[PDB]
Design a protein around this motif. Structure first.
Motif, PDB file in Angstrom:
ATOM      1  N   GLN A 114     -33.261 -35.080  27.870  1.00 47.05           N
ATOM      2  CA  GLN A 114     -31.904 -34.882  27.404  1.00 47.05           C
ATOM      3  C   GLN A 114     -31.803 -33.800  26.334  1.00 47.05           C
ATOM      4  O   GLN A 114     -32.618 -33.785  25.382  1.00 47.05           O
ATOM      5  N   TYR A 115     -30.847 -32.871  26.489  1.00 50.73           N
ATOM      6  CA  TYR A 115     -30.648 -31.845  25.548  1.00 50.73           C
ATOM      7  C   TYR A 115     -29.351 -32.137  24.849  1.00 50.73           C
ATOM      8  O   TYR A 115     -28.307 -32.372  25.501  1.00 50.73           O
ATOM      9  N   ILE A 116     -29.408 -32.040  23.525  1.00 54.57           N
ATOM     10  CA  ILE A 116     -28.227 -32.197  22.704  1.00 54.57           C
ATOM     11  C   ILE A 116     -27.893 -30.945  21.928  1.00 54.57           C
ATOM     12  O   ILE A 116     -28.643 -30.527  21.049  1.00 54.57           O
ATOM     13  N   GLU A 117     -26.764 -30.361  22.265  1.00 50.64           N
ATOM     14  CA  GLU A 117     -26.330 -29.130  21.616  1.00 50.64           C
ATOM     15  C   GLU A 117     -25.849 -29.384  20.190  1.00 50.64           C
ATOM     16  O   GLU A 117     -25.717 -30.523  19.776  1.00 50.64           O
ATOM     17  N   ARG A 118     -25.671 -28.301  19.431  1.00 47.55           N
ATOM     18  CA  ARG A 118     -25.306 -28.353  18.011  1.00 47.55           C
ATOM     19  C   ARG A 118     -23.940 -29.013  17.888  1.00 47.55           C
ATOM     20  O   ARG A 118     -23.746 -29.811  17.008  1.00 47.55           O
ATOM     21  N   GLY A 173     -22.881 -31.216  19.779  1.00 47.78           N
ATOM     22  CA  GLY A 173     -23.020 -32.602  20.242  1.00 47.78           C
ATOM     23  C   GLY A 173     -22.998 -32.759  21.737  1.00 47.78           C
ATOM     24  O   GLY A 173     -23.202 -33.831  22.234  1.00 47.78           O
ATOM     25  N   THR A 174     -22.762 -31.695  22.502  1.00 48.04           N
ATOM     26  CA  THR A 174     -22.704 -31.847  23.968  1.00 48.04           C
ATOM     27  C   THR A 174     -24.078 -32.290  24.509  1.00 48.04           C
ATOM     28  O   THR A 174     -25.119 -31.720  24.099  1.00 48.04           O
ATOM     29  N   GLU A 175     -24.102 -33.330  25.343  1.00 44.23           N
ATOM     30  CA  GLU A 175     -25.381 -33.858  25.868  1.00 44.23           C
ATOM     31  C   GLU A 175     -25.534 -33.533  27.345  1.00 44.23           C
ATOM     32  O   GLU A 175     -24.556 -33.657  28.134  1.00 44.23           O
ATOM     33  N   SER A 176     -26.730 -33.122  27.752  1.00 46.16           N
ATOM     34  CA  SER A 176     -27.036 -32.871  29.153  1.00 46.16           C
ATOM     35  C   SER A 176     -28.331 -33.541  29.537  1.00 46.16           C
ATOM     36  O   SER A 176     -29.339 -33.506  28.810  1.00 46.16           O
ATOM     37  N   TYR A 177     -28.359 -34.043  30.756  1.00 44.23           N
ATOM     38  CA  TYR A 177     -29.561 -34.608  31.311  1.00 44.23           C
ATOM     39  C   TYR A 177     -30.208 -33.642  32.309  1.00 44.23           C
ATOM     40  O   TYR A 177     -29.509 -33.003  33.172  1.00 44.23           O
ATOM     41  N   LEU A 178     -31.524 -33.505  32.200  1.00 45.20           N
ATOM     42  CA  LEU A 178     -32.350 -32.541  32.971  1.00 45.20           C
ATOM     43  C   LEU A 178     -33.721 -33.146  33.254  1.00 45.20           C
ATOM     44  O   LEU A 178     -34.017 -34.367  32.970  1.00 45.20           O
TER      45      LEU A 178
END
Length: 220
Positions: free
Chosen positions: A80-84, A86-91
């Motif tokens: 999971q990537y969490i942007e500055r 707060g947007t979260e993405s699963y990869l």
């Protein structure tokens, strides 16, 4: 949940639990309050990259110097990537955007290092049962003082690892509890409200006073 933690800590500390005529700290132990997650290992590489950590389930994360976060689940592939913002993405590691090549490579270096070189804090604790389908908590913030490193997780947990005697506190506002890992690595989990009623030893009371100051610093 920091405010909830603070209300809980004010209440316990205001009871002056080490100043009881008969401290019965044992009666405040509650195994049902054992945490699900805590930080077992960490690496401060903030001179270059950021702070990497391992949670007790073998998952890993990194909080980068740019205030983004990457979390590797304990399947060893789900990311999971969490942007500055707060947007979260699963990869996944096996199928990732090339834009994250570098940060994933950094994660794998933190992961390999922690795996082979550091002790697992609380390796003697069987964690409370959680839900494999729920998201992992991630590291929201951290800092260091003269005496400790302070680690705040996204599930509200605040962990304080003391440098000189290796003692540690895991505080959870959801279970309203504190796990104390002493200099021998023995651990006990206390329900804060039971500490109000039964008392505790000076060592733990002092650490809970310290904890309140840390939570205040986190809220600020």
């Amino acid at each position: 949940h920091l405010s909830d933690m603070l209300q809980q800590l004010h209440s316990v500390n205001a009871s002056k639990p080490s100043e009881r005529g008969l401290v019965r700290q044992e009666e405040a132990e509650d195994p049902a309050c054992i945490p699900i997650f805590w930080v077992s290992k960490w690496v401060d590489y903030s001179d270059k990259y950021g702070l990497g950590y391992q949670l007790c389930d073998n998952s890993v994360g990194v909080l980068f110097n740019d205030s983004t976060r990457l979390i590797l689940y304990n399947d060893g592939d789900s990311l999971q990537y969490i942007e500055r913002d707060g947007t979260e993405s699963y990869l996944t590691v096996s199928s990732h955007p090339n834009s994250l090549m570098k940060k994933i490579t950094l994660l794998k270096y933190f992961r390999n290092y922690m795996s082979e070189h550091l002790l697992k804090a609380g390796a003697n604790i069987t964690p409370r049962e959680g839900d494999e389908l729920a998201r992992l908590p991630y590291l929201r913030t951290w800092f260091r003082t003269r005496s400790a490193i302070i680690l705040h997780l996204s599930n509200g947990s605040v962990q304080i690892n003391f440098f000189q005697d290796h003692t540690k506190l895991i505080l959870c506002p959801l279970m309203a509890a504190v796990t104390y890992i002493d200099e021998k690595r023995d651990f006990r989990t206390y329900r804060l409200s039971l500490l109000e009623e039964y008392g505790c030893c000076k060592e733990l009371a002092s650490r809970l006073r310290y904890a309140r100051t840390m939570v205040d610093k986190l809220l600020s």
